[PDB]
Design a protein around this ligand. Structure first.
Ligand SMILES: CCCC(=O)N[C@H]1/C(=N/OC(=O)Nc2ccccc2)O[C@H](CO)[C@@H](O)[C@@H]1O
Length: 322
């Protein structure tokens, strides 16, 4: 596995996608709604991605529930992360949501969902009900549940958006000017200390009190804090670098230098090709810890009472608070 995550245009691999997936700088494919028509087509696409690469490769998607669930039709609908703590058995339901989301992805040959959201509060329009709660204990309590469900089916976990995007309220980059973000960061600290996060995705947010760089490209945030002060041992992602530093190669290089193990380039095939063409090849062997640890089909999954219940329970929960 190489450092680079990239994406494809549609439902099937093109000739160019195939040549791209063969390149050892590629380490993963991130999927979107546009890569999804139906269950069968998705299996077919993921099998083609794995064939084209002819080596282990990661397949990921933003499947959080609520406002962020790329694959809905033919899947169990997963509620907004916010809903769990609002039920009377929020921990129980949040673990069901996590296991169910992860289990259905796996049934469809997807390695991981980029989740859970560990941001605190609902006031940032882009986060909103994607957050588990509005205080440290509600977030920890309910994200841990969700995260235990992911782990139970053998899916690696990615906390986002480090060090916390919950308080972001007119430049190329959002700002959070509080002189302390200790509570937001405490959430991330507890999950790291508990050893439950396989990976971390940082926020594209500047915390001026702390550092001039958006956290996603910050040596302070990604190395001094994330590694040194907090002891994170897992995979650090960058933010989407297709969006100061220079062109794609320099941006990719600054992200890697800053402390990312893997970099994402979405929605810009020519920037990705420029990076494939020009970046020296590096291996990211420790990204293999992100490959799903289980294997099964959807109809095997549906034979579990655990599935029959989580599925009915998630639909019920969505109805309750919608
Ligand atoms: C903006 C709130 C934080 C967020 O939603 N970040 C997501 C995220 N956001 O991406 C962008 O905002 N990209 C972008 C923004 C402006 C210009 C160009 C790209 O990308 C990742 C991969 O898809 C997701 O897993 C992240 O959770």
């Amino acid at each position: 596995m190489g450092p680079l995550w990239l994406d494809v245009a549609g439902y099937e691999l093109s000739a160019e996608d195939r040549a791209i997936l063969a390149h050892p700088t590629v380490g993963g494919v991130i999927l979107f709604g546009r890569n999804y028509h139906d269950n069968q087509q998705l299996l077919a696409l993921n099998k083609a991605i794995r064939q084209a690469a002819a080596r282990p490769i990661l397949i990921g998607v933003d499947q959080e529930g609520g406002r962020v669930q790329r694959f809905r039709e033919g899947f169990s609908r997963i509620p907004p992360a916010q809903y769990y703590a609002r039920a009377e058995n929020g921990v129980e339901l949040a673990e069901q949501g996590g296991w169910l989301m992860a289990a259905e992805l796996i049934a469809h040959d997807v390695d991981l969902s980029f989740a859970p959201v560990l941001d605190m509060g609902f006031a940032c329009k882009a986060i909103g009900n994607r957050a588990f709660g509005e205080d440290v204990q509600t977030v920890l309590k309910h994200s841990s549940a969700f995260l235990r469900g992911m782990k139970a089916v053998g899916m690696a976990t990615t906390g986002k958006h480090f060090p916390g995007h919950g308080a972001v309220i007119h430049l190329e980059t959002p700002y959070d000017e509080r002189e302390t973000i200790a509570q937001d960061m405490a959430i991330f600290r507890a999950q790291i200390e508990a050893g439950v996060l396989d990976a971390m995705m940082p926020a594209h947010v500047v915390y001026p009190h702390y550092d001039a760089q958006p956290a996603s490209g910050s040596s302070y945030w990604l190395k001094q804090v994330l590694r040194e002060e907090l002891g994170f041992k897992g995979i650090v992602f960058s933010d989407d670098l297709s969006m100061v530093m220079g062109g794609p190669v320099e941006r990719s290089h600054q992200a890697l230098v800053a402390g990312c193990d893997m970099i994402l380039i979405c929605n810009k095939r020519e920037a990705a090709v420029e990076v494939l063409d020009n970046l020296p090849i590096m291996e990211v062997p420790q990204a293999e810890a992100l490959l799903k640890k289980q294997q099964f089909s959807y109809s095997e999954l549906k034979r579990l009472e655990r599935w029959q219940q989580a599925s009915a329970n998630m639909q019920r929960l969505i109805e309750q608070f919608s």
